[PDB]
Assembly symmetry: D2
Homo-oligomer: 298 residues x 4
């Protein structure tokens, strides 16, 4: 039974990490972006994730973000720390830091690059969980970036590791999504792919964690509500609108396209991702500007 | 191709004990499908085992289904072969037997360029002589890895009137619907039917519809009426069944269920497919019984 | 004692005509052309031979004709493989009637089959060939089937399997297979690695390009046996120079066009849905033919 | 590529040994370095995937670069693998190795996030800048990184200013030959040990590898075999190398090699960093034997 992490369910923005033209942490843009999310009406933030550019950061720089975010939002919203690295030891330290700063849960993407066994994946989550010292874990499953494809049985076994009470399921397999839900009726189950949120909710996901929620996170809230109320037509209406914007972001690069729109909304000073992520192309700037305006009026 | 919209059963081809066509079980299976209230039949598809059948065999199934159901339901003829000329031969015959549409899976095995693929479909469309084309995108089988730009061009070929989308990618499903608002769009994976309609499918084609096409019609109804709980419940019960069938092999597992339901005389597929494993038989009867209660 | 199937064996092309019917006259030529090249034998009606865009009957008339032109002069393997066991079984007995030396089959495709189902498919075709050695044909790029080494080891140990056509690029596996089966007849399937495939432990080859330059591939076998490495590397690199162009052209229609300017194949068409050769490639394929004729 | 000919040869992928608490076992690193020079290795590839880079901080990687300079400068060629995901991090590692006097720097194509090809080019370019004269060895490792380069993409990367070499860890020997035929003077390392001979036949003029840490001499033995034109010997060695690689694949390659390195008492603790677990129990018999076999035939 997963009633232990039931408080973690809902729509949660995957926190982008702001930087300057020196490629340093921009801490005033982080604060600005957190508060911006809080006032959109988000249920929480997922910090230092892929969307967070965690794998172009030092542990120190991840800790500094963790610390600021908690200072800004602890007790206002649910806060989840993505602590995952390839190394178990690196992931434990981050997991220790998140605890110190008063996060509500820790999370880790399956460790990547080297092909570790399933046994070696489970020991890893147990290690972080223990270092989390009371914080429940969100298993992050994002096969398209990690190259770790997990089966149902494997997943099943991970989300019943003691101390686990949630799954970031960034997978387009909406059959697997239903099986997870049918099998784990209590489990907090984060639809992971913004562009399928509605369908994912329908298949048994009870919220999400996504990149695009930083710039229109109320639209996703509307989807949850519209389907709890039997208004499929508005849920569809909202998903379509979300996906015209995801279409744009895909063309421009997702995280830096998001950053750019946050720049025009007066939230982020410098809309750059860390190298080797290049700059957005100037030809999308008119469409990212127009989008910044559409979304502020809404 | 407006009136092609709906829940269409991907018809299984029955075989006798010596692995020839079973004409009797077949006719039984078609009527059994009409009973359940299906909107139409996709004849001689992947589920149909067309790729372990001769052209004349595929034509024999085709003529016989039209005879059982023409007028009563919509009938789509999967005429797809690796060869353009073979494919054309089945298109010409669907025409003759009075079929409503033809369909075709992307030619497989040999890498064919997108240009050649496009040409494949224009030939078959001309040989189908006014019968609208159903494009079948079934990458898990064919290995053809089609994009949106590619799909967009296929579905907007003159003659093309519908897409069978056997893809799990419900972003692309929503994407296709938005570019082509008039397109007949068939969710192809039973096991996401509800989620697929939600993303923009307007009907479906499926193998498991042969044994519970009413549950799919129930998911179209419940969604239509804002009835969210019921659809999810109805999708869930389908997935408990597909769970099993995946353990048993979808095609022969369906066939057995229909064996226990009095429609199919011998529940075998064509070699290289093997028998259903005997440990599973009880649950397939259990499921036969339970589904026979239901309707 | 199937060790007499060892050799360089051209994956025969199946000529069609203007209207896509078989071109039996150009086919008989191509058989006799191949016999001139000093080829050890022919692999008939494989993937190179556009098997799967032909009817069983067309495939049967090709096999017959080859057996008319070549039986007892070279070796002859008949590719009889289909998705259907029963249809593959029609083709093997037919291959047995025409006096072929061997049958072959690619892993049945399109539908996934369990590995148990594959062995039975092989087991059954073997019964229908009635004593002809079976060449199991592993071609992942086209078939989509992904055999493991234990699964390959199991397949070559089935009663009646004499050989393996290993169209993989994985030459760790090529070596592993040799090590498990020192007397296995092991054909290299990718022509663009032939020499390196021999070094890993193939003892011959099967390939589409042997149709136009098989003697180079016999040049390579000799070279290696001579211990001459520069020659073996030059020949391989020369084959890869041609293969580079055949992939720009599309290899099968490329080969038919080289043979068409070698005035051997009457019309250079593969069956639809394949298209003809991009018009703007003709000068190269022309020169390469002139080139290759001057060479032989 | 002329400018880098001196980098041709058989280079061991240096492992990074750790003590019972997973720290840099500094004395063991020093021993392995000398063991490789005492094998007759042409050079050392340091801080790579076999070197367990991505379970280490920049600090620890710099320490290993630092120590290996001490042991190996002026004795054998030294290549530092400086690659990270973040460019700025790789650039730090690249200046370090220039400061320590390495002969060349190397980076595997940045991974996890899917970067466009321009973004890969710029990254080598900016890592090159920091290496300030040191040649760049581009490292193509699809199995691990998940980055699949087309032939033209490889051709563009190996002719970026300052690139002299390519670690081609890919069993596609057609491509190997195309790479050779397209750049006759490029230093082309065969990355997959299980196909060294065939790799060297297709156009590779050397190698970088993990198993070389326990049997380099066989791989050099293969080079000579093929220079002489004795395919019989080339084949025999390649076969023996693959019998061991067969075993290491079963055990875990990097942990396998660290375990044989224990039984030559070259390495103190044979562990890899978590989430690499320990080698299984049933495999310790074969590896001991293997160590003893490898010492006995060494002399
Ligand atoms: C066509 C194919 O998949 N394989 C052929 C037979 O093995 C090869 O010989 C290729 O035709 C040739 O090597 C080009 O890749």
């Amino acid at each position: 039974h997963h009633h232990h992490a039931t408080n973690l369910r809902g729509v949660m923005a995957a926190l982008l990490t702001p930087f300057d033209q020196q490629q340093a942490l921009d801490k005033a843009s982080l604060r600005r972006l957190v508060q911006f999310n809080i006032q959109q009406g988000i249920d929480g933030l997922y910090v230092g994730g892929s969307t967070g550019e965690a794998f172009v950061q030092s542990l120190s720089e991840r800790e500094q973000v963790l610390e600021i975010v908690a200072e800004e939002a602890k007790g206002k919203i649910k806060l989840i720390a993505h602590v995952g690295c390839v190394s178990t030891a690196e992931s434990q330290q981050l997991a220790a830091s998140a605890k110190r700063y008063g996060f509500d849960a820790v999370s880790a993407v399956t460790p990547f690059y080297y092909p570790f066994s399933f046994e070696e994946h489970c020991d890893h989550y147990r290690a972080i969980i223990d270092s989390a010292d009371g914080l429940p874990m969100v298993v992050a499953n994002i096969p398209a970036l990690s190259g770790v494809k997990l089966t149902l049985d494997q997943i099943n076994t991970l989300v019943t590791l003691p101390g686990v009470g949630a799954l970031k399921q960034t997978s387009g397999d909406l059959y697997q999504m239903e099986q997870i839900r049918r099998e784990h009726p209590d489990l907090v189950l984060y639809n992971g792919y913004d562009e399928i949120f509605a369908s994912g909710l329908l298949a048994g996901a009870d919220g999400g964690i996504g990149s695009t929620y930083n710039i229109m996170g109320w639209r996703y809230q509307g989807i949850v509500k519209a389907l709890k109320e039997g208004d499929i037509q508005t849920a569809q209406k909202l998903q379509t609108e979300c996906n015209k914007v995801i279409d744009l972001l895909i063309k421009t690069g997702v995280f830096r396209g998001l950053k750019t729109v946050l720049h025009y909304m007066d939230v982020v000073s410098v809309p750059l991702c860390r190298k080797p992520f290049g700059p957005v192309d100037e030809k999308y700037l008119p469409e990212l500007k127009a989008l910044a305006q559409q979304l502020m009026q809404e």
